[PDB]
């Protein structure tokens, strides 16, 4: 018999993104080639099958630095990290291939699905 | 020119609640009288003006245990902690007074608003 506040989840994600922008309570650095991205492990896990697996590992759960596969493009990762914290995906003709490849590696099934759809249309 | 995934924020919150239920990456214990509640500091901050203030404090940000005011009712806190992680509020005749008082203390303005509305109706 609960009541529900429709905007609650969006407001929570908006505040988590504000914490990220201000580097508050970030607990991991994701290294992608020469580029570094600070984030919250819980948000990464909630969005990505790969980070979910990494941070549930009894040894990796305690690492403050995670290095991605050298094939991963820093821009594709940046676009996906922004999507994790906002629900908004900056999908463009010039980045769609790198975004799909990065989403497949990160195991972000809904992003992979829209990339496959957008590629099929063109 | 971003696209948006409508269910993303709700799915993120659902996964954060799954992490809470399994006690994964929880980093704080909230003590309410004899009762203890494990949670993620970032989620508490995203939902509550009080936890936002506590965990942005340069000394309190590093505490693993937070003791609430002894007037705070453990059931009212439990109902609010569930709301933080689900958007669902178990508001009942028998708990509404304790829920409003706890939401006022935690600085959860939308919960305070619905409690004031529900009390006014009766």
């Amino acid at each position: 018999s609960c009541i529900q506040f429709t905007r609650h989840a969006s407001d929570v994600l908006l505040n988590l993104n504000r914490l990220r922008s201000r580097d508050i309570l970030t607990d991991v650095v994701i290294v992608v080639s020469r580029e570094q991205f600070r984030a919250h492990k819980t948000v990464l896990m909630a969005c990505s099958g790969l980070f979910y697996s990494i941070f549930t590992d009894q040894l990796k759960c305690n690492l403050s630095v995670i290095n991605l596969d050298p094939e991963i493009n820093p821009e594709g990762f940046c676009i996906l990290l922004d999507f994790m914290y906002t629900s908004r995906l900056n999908l463009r003709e010039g980045n769609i291939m790198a975004v799909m490849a990065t989403a497949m590696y990160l195991q972000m099934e809904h992003v992979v699905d829209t990339c496959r759809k957008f590629i099929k249309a063109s | 020119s971003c696209i948006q995934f409508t269910r993303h924020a709700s799915d993120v919150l659902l996964n954060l609640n799954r992490l809470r239920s399994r006690d994964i990456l929880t980093d704080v214990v909230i003590v309410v009288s004899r009762e203890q509640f494990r949670a993620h500091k970032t989620v508490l901050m995203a939902c509550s003006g009080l936890f936002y203030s506590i965990f942005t404090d340069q000394l309190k940000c590093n505490l693993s245990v937070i003791n609430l005011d002894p007037e705070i009712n453990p059931e009212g806190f439990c109902i609010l902690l569930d709301f933080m992680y689900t958007s669902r509020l178990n508001l009942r005749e028998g708990n509404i007074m304790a829920v409003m008082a706890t939401a006022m203390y935690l600085q959860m303005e939308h919960v305070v608003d619905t409690c004031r509305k529900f009390i006014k109706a009766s």
Binding site: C2, I3, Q4, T6 | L89, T114
Partner: peptide
């Protein structure tokens, strides 16, 4: 607020 809604009835979910």
């Amino acid at each position: 607020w809604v009835i979910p």
